[PDB]
Amino acid sequence: QYSNQNSFV
């Protein structure tokens, strides 16, 4: 299981 969460402003 592979999760990536990226938030820019």
Q: How far apart are CA 3 and CA 9, in angstroms?
A: 20
Resolution (A): 1.0
Contacts of 1 (CB under 8 A, 6+ apart): none
Longest CA pairwise span in the chain (Å): 26
Q: Where are the alpha helices (DSSP H) in 1-9?
A: none
**3-state SS track over 1-9:** CCCCCCCCC
- Computed over its alpha carbons, how large is the radius of gyration of the chain? 9
